[PDB]
């Protein structure tokens, strides 16, 4: 087993930035690694192989370096679309292993959530089971802290949240969160809120609805 | 390019066997010509190396993880590469990837998701999240796919016309063991007349389809 040690296991950096990542083997592996760029939901695509010839099609931003025991991929130019899980593999010997990985997300200024509320359909209803869906629209960075107050109290622990990748275009996320009730609970209560920090806020953002109305 | 199209496997419980398959087109030379690999991707990790096979289809290799249990193997004649899987485990629940790595011929397949549980297969409920206070000069509106096993499911929005504006969610897994997740797409305010927004959900593991128009409150 070539043991694979990628670094970093993860970075933020602006476009137009170089970015380098780094592999190490602990074999000798001569010249035989390869490195992948993986896309959210998408399969790993080849970007160098034998060390530092770059596949054809793959932006020359992509260069591939060293020999031995370390290489070094690096991005000229980080652009938008470069959002990916980086990967190398040794192609040298099995069984085939390869790197943790290195996320790479872009930086970018600062962009405060639109936020959004849903109540729970008549649908649903009818159905016994009530969700309040909570919506956080286009921002950056990713770390925003989204709480859920039903008249005022807050709740832990029924509800999760889900993000999409950072916006391959404008570099932004999304963000749901989806606070989940029985009919019975759900009926014994006036408003519902969800209530969103983040660094674009100079102040909690508060959006709810009494129900019903 | 070489192209790879894999095929199989889906929901499968702890012991059952699944099969996967793949097919390939686009070597320079004959596919025979050709080793051959599987690489797999477990929900939240990197990925696993998990077999290869030779040209003829001898001789092979096998991750620990799945030696004993696993076969790989290969029809010339047909351009097609197998995955013979028993044993199966709970650890084996990932995305599987035909991959060529032979250099200079590197293609990797889309990846077919294999899912071993003992929960069985189940049709979402689909409940509009309904255009409203999710509102300025622009307003959003969504589809709550929920309750469902196991993944996937797709969403389009009036049969794919309107790309403009959707963000589909990852899906979670609730507490329950089912999944669930939203599809929002933001239209133009006054737009909501007048314009009718129907989304669609389609699980292929329920043979199931629902269309649903949403609609203002």
């Known amino acids: 087993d070539i043991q694979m040690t990628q670094s970093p296991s993860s970075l933020s950096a602006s476009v137009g930035d170089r970015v380098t990542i780094t592999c190490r083997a602990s074999?000798?592996?001569?010249?035989?690694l390869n490195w992948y760029q993986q896309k959210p939901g998408k399969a790993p695509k080849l970007l160098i192989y034998?060390?530092?010839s770059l596949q054809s099609g793959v932006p020359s931003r992509f260069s591939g370096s060293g020999s031995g025991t370390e290489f070094t991929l690096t991005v000229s130019s980080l652009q938008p679309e470069d959002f990916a899980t980086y990967y190398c593999?040794?192609?040298?010997?099995?069984?085939?292993?390869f790197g943790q990985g290195t996320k790479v997300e872009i930086k970018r200024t600062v962009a405060a959530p639109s936020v959004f509320i849903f109540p729970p359909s008549d649908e649903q209803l009818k159905s016994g089971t009530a969700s309040v869906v909570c919506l956080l629209n286009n921002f950056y960075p990713r770390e925003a802290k989204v709480q859920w107050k039903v008249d005022n109290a807050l709740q832990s622990g029924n509800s999760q949240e889900s993000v999409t990748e950072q916006d391959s275009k404008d570099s932004t996320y999304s963000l749901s969160s989806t606070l989940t009730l029985s009919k019975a609970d759900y009926e014994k209560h006036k408003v519902y809120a969800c209530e969103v920090t983040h660094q674009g806020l100079s102040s909690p953002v508060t959006k709810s609805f009494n129900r019903g109305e | 390019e070489v192209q790879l199209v894999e095929s199989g496997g889906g929901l499968a419980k702890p012991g059952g066997s699944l099969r996967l398959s793949c097919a390939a087109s686009?070597?320079?030379?004959?596919?025979?010509?050709?080793?051959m690999d599987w690489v797999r991707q477990a929900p939240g990790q990197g990925l696993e190396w998990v077999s290869r096979?030779?040209?003829?289809?001898?001789?092979?290799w096998y991750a620990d993880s799945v030696k004993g249990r696993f076969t790989i193997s290969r029809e010339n004649a047909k351009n097609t590469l197998f995955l013979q899987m028993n044993s199966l485990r709970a650890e084996d629940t990932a995305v599987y990837y035909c991959?060529?790595?032979?250099?200079?011929?590197?293609?990797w397949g889309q990846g077919v998701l294999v899912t071993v549980s003992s929960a069985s297969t189940k049709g979402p409920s689909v409940f509009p999240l309904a255009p409203s206070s999710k509102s300025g000069g622009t307003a959003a509106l969504g589809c709550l796919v929920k309750d469902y096993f196991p993944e996937p499911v797709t969403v389009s929005w009036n049969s794919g016309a309107l790309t403009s504006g959707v963000h589909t969610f990852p899906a979670v897994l609730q507490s329950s063991g089912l999944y669930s997740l939203s599809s929002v797409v933001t239209v133009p305010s006054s737009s909501l007349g007048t314009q009718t927004y129907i989304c669609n959900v389609n699980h292929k593991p329920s043979n199931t389809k629902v269309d649903k128009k949403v609609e203002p409150k």
């Open positions: 991959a060529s790595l032979t250099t200079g011929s590197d293609s």
């Open positions: 686009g070597f320079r030379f004959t596919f025979n010509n050709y080793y």
């Open positions: 096979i030779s040209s003829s289809g001898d001789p092979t």
């Open positions: 074999q000798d592996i001569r010249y035989y």
């Open positions: 034998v060390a530092s």
């Open positions: 593999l040794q192609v040298y010997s099995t069984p085939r292993t």
